[PDB]
Amino acid sequence: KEKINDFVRGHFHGCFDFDLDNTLYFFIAGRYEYKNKGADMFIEALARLNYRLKVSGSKKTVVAFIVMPAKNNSFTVEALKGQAEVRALENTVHEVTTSIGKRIFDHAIRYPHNGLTTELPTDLGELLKSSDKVMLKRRILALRRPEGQLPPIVTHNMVDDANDLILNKIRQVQLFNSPSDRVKMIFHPEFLNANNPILGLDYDEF
Amino acid sequence: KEKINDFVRGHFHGCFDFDLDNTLYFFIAGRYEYKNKGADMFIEALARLNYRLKVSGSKKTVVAFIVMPAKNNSFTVEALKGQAEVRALENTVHEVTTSIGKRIFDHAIRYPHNGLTTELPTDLGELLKSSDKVMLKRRILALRRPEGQLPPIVTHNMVDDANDLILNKIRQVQLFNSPSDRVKMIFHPEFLNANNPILGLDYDEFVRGCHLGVFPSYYEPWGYTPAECTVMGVPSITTNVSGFGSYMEDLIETNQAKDYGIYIVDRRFKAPDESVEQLVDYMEEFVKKTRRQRINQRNRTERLSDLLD
Amino acid sequence: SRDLQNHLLFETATEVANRVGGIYSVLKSKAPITVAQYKDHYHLIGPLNKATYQNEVDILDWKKPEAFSDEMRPVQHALQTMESRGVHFVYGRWLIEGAPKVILFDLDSVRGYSNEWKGDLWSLVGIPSPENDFETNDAILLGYTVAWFLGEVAHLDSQHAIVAHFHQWLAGVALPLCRKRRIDVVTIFTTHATLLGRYLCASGSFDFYNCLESVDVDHEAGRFGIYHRYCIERAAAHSADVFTTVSQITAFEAEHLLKRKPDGILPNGLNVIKFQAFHEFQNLHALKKEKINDFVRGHFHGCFDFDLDNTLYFFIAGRYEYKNKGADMFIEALARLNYRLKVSGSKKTVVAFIVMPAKNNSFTVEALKGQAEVRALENTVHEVTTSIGKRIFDHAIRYPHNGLTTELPTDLGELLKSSDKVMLKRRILALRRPEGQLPPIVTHNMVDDANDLILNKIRQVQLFNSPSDRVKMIFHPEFLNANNPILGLDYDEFVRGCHLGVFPSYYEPWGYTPAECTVMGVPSITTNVSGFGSYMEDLIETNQAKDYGIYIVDRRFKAPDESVEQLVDYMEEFVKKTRRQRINQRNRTERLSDLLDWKRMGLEYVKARQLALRRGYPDQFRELVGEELNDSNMDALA
Ligand SMILES: O=c1ccn([C@@H]2O[C@H](COP(=O)(O)OP(=O)(O)O[C@H]3O[C@H](CO)[C@@H](O)[C@H](O)[C@H]3F)[C@@H](O)[C@H]2O)c(=O)[nH]1
Ligand SMILES: O=c1ccn([C@@H]2O[C@H](COP(=O)(O)OP(=O)(O)O)[C@@H](O)[C@H]2O)c(=O)[nH]1
Ligand SMILES: O=c1ccn([C@@H]2O[C@H](COP(=O)(O)OP(=O)(O)O)[C@@H](O)[C@H]2O)c(=O)[nH]1
Ligand SMILES: O=P(O)(O)OC[C@H]1O[C@H](O)[C@H](O)[C@@H](O)[C@@H]1O
């Protein structure tokens, strides 16, 4: 689940308005047989669930995955960039927390000497310096997405996007991953594999 | 030097009121020859240095090490506990900063949604929870020393503590690592070795980490000790009755030699109390230096090591 | 009765808070000494970039009484007058070292005035301003707005003498207005190039440096469709109390093309970041180089057949001006260098980066996936070594019991299990690339790949990053920034990581690009027709200059083909160096930093301001100093 969470933060970079501790992960998968496999029904019911949850005031979020193979030209640049920007924020946080550590540690070892009156730091300024703040703010800027751009409904560039049965159905029911939709939609038109650059899970693990 | 610091924090646990970024490490090392290796001058000089630094209101600290083998029953319980107590605080801080990490990250990735008005957290309470505080306070309590206990002057249990020349001399001059002393004494009665459980450095590594060797020898036909020290780019005090000192004295004009990290005490044409006062003048002249001055002096000392090849 | 010692300074430029090129770098790097000297009397001025000003400018409240002193009070009243005629602006601290107060004017806020202002410029200066050109529109708007502003300050303030300094023709429309309106300020104009000089060199046809005196400026300004802009630049240079360039090369050029001999040179400085340890810059080189190594490994996944420990990194960087910045010579020289290195059997590898912005649709999927593929292998390796660790540890702690007869494991199989081998082999497969596919020569998808000048030149010389090529090419058509997903470095960091900067410019009034390398202890190749190269050539004997990491290519007194061969000689001489010799050359390069510090260069700006005050108020200057001093130029006065 935590690897799924990693992908999902990247996919929703700059539009991340829900708590993953209160998010559920539904999926459909198999060969791309729109009618036979239930993909038409799945997408329809999710749209009705999305309406149902909004009405009842639910705080849950469903992220729904479709894993069926379609003709594509690999992953979108947005799917990969989002992943990299998140990875980059992580690494920046790790540098900052390492500094925080040295400052907490010095305070702890020195108390109660040199005018330290509390066992621990009380003010965030004792731990978090302006250079630390600058690089975090830059990492946050990298994750911002354009005015009115929503999290996409597909992870790849499709050969025939305009005629695809699953995408046209998602567009018809109007699940565009709006912030007010409690049900999110992600079509992944490739079979899962641990060498996948965005979601490095084999299907069984996923 | 970071490995020495790590040892010093342990040694001074519950008594750590000075700044390691502004602490210098002096050492003497060799065979236990109290008189011939100058250990008596060294300790006597340090006690006078301590006086001069206190009077001048200097905020610097010198921690002097004596590395000379004496019969012992290995490390004290105190030495080992402090090392482990400090590690235990390290690991607990590492847990807590991992937590702080998750919380900073969440805020960063989530901004500006769900009421996050600032890009970063501003209140420490968002990052540091009460379970985290309880852990850290417990580690801090483990580091507390009993009322009125001072960091020891020795790391080991000694076979004949009461008749040991070095410890008798340290106690005679009353260098007991009191908080108001700006000079600290640590006698480590065993050659260094990276298997050592409290200061896991071999000797060459230890020397590199230090700031100044002090080797006021009285009988010393060569003096391999300051020579090695010079080869590691560490400045050092020697004497004109040491063969290393005699050789450098003849090879460089003595006021210029201080620039290349070679201080030479005169023990041949001066009364002992004049030699001690000169040794203090050199130590005090070195403490005064800034970091940039220390760095460039080491550079010059390292060049000088071509001459000993 | 205006005070000459306690005076205001107003510095005006289009790049005041948005990077276009080197002028941004001048104003920024120069702010610490300028603020140190003036404090609350200094103000930068420019056009408000409504899009990008958010990132760099701290917005301040100019209306509160606390935001100005009482001697500086007139500047507030002047801004309150501009408000009461509807001129919108922004007051703020620029978020740089120095922290200088800025005044950015909204050019949309006076756009209604365009036609009567364009007309006043025609009738009362002479400048035809065809409506087509949105650049010369915005220059006229800015210039009229600023001359209006200084007009108010000059009337409302009666204590301070005022120095108005302006950089480039874009900010120089205010100059003729201050002269024509007899406004009580003294003006400096600094030009960082010439319009005609760019365009003459760009059309890389003729021998500009030697055949300069014989160009008909009116004919030539005509044929380039530049005359209306050339006329602004000329009026700036002619209307200023003091006129300056940045280099002697450009001074020679501004004499003959703008028709006024400059009063002196304002050579460009850097804000020299000292370290407490001199050697700290060497450590930074090795840190930043490792991040470049990380990128390279991804770029060459499945085609990685060289040792990065025996690989050097050359770069050219700058705005996309193919002839003027010398991208042509660079690519040509690398191709010959490749041939020399193959012939002499060299084991070294050179990876050449070209960092020049071009129209693009972001990074290729390929370049991103490789980074992801390499990062994924790294983590699998980390997993595998953790397990290896448990196993060495068990062996070591158990020895010599339970039949462990040697202190350490001897067979790999004790440590590396088959499940470990299976995941490592999967990651190796993900890095594999199809039969015959070569590492790209470019990291982005181009708009107009087939017509791009750099790509066509790389194709012409056939540097396709083949395994037998000892020189590799990577074109990165965007400026570097630490949020970049494939090479997460800021430009300064990347420069520290590299080994050699290569900037064989034909047209370069100064060239901060090699100067920035020098300050970072990175050797650079420049030319004798560049401001920086001419300047350094004058200070160091040209063979000694190579040992301090200042390689200068002769593009004045040599045929273009001799220059290419000289550039190649330099590259090959550098490639032959051992590591020790590289480390020693970088130290020698670093020592030259002091020569480029603003603490030295910024004295020329003081001479330029003194001369303005000496020309504007001769009587007062005389009685302040004691003699009638020579005002003919900057050095004659000092
Ligand atoms: O990825 C990158 C790569 C480079 N840069 C920066 O771009 C700047 C280029 O200035 P440079 O002086 O080399 O030439 P430029 O201003 O383009 O042209 C001339 O004309 C100029 C007109 O002002 C004159 O000042 C200049 O000296 C002349 F040669 C330089 O300061 C780099 O640090 C960057 O921000 N990011
Ligand atoms: O990313 C994926 C998703 C599914 N599967 C497998 O492919 C089969 C899908 O079956 P299919 O849709 O062909 O027919 P079903 O058995 O589902 O009716 C299952 O056995 C899954 O284990 C896979 O290998 N990779
Ligand atoms: O912890 C230590 C301290 C010293 N030494 C070595 O001990 C020698 C000192 O020599 P000693 O005092 O035994 O007599 P000397 O040879 O100086 O006359 C030097 O060469 C040091 O390298 C060592 O190996 N480990
Ligand atoms: O990148 P190179 O020119 O090979 O330099 C590599 C060198 O860089 C710096 O000097 C480092 O401090 C050295 O440890 C390293 O050997």
From Swiss-Prot, chain C:
Interacts with PCL10. It is found in: Cytoplasm, Cytosol. The modification Phosphoserine is found at residues 158, 362, 466. This is Glycogen [starch] synthase isoform 2. Glycogen synthase participates in the glycogen biosynthetic process along with glycogenin and glycogen branching enzyme. Extends the primer composed of a few glucose units formed by glycogenin by adding new glucose units to it. In this context, glycogen synthase transfers the glycosyl residue from UDP-Glc to the non-reducing end of alpha-1,4-glucan. It comes from Saccharomyces cerevisiae (strain ATCC 204508 / S288c) (Baker's yeast). Present with 14600 molecules/cell in log phase SD medium. Allosteric activation by glucose-6-phosphate, and phosphorylation by a cAMP-dependent kinase. One of its GO terms (biological process) is glycogen biosynthetic process. Transmembrane segments: none annotated. Belongs to the glycosyltransferase 3 family. UDP binds at residues 19, 319, 513. Keywords: Allosteric enzyme, Cytoplasm, Glycogen biosynthesis, Glycosyltransferase, Phosphoprotein, Transferase. GO terms for molecular function: alpha-1,4-glucan glucosyltransferase (UDP-glucose donor) activity; glycogen binding; identical protein binding. InterPro entries: Glycogen_synth. Phosphorylated by the cyclin-CDK PCL10-PHO85. Phosphorylation causes inactivation of enzyme. Pathway: Glycan biosynthesis; glycogen biosynthesis. UDP-alpha-D-glucose binds at residues 192, 198, 319, 508, 510-511. It catalyses: [(1->4)-alpha-D-glucosyl](n) + UDP-alpha-D-glucose = [(1->4)-alpha-D-glucosyl](n+1) + UDP + H(+). Its EC number is 2.4.1.11. One of its GO terms (cellular component) is cytoplasm. Pfam families: Glycogen_syn (PF05693). Alpha-D-glucose 6-phosphate binds at residues 279-280, 282, 285, 289, 499, 582, 586.
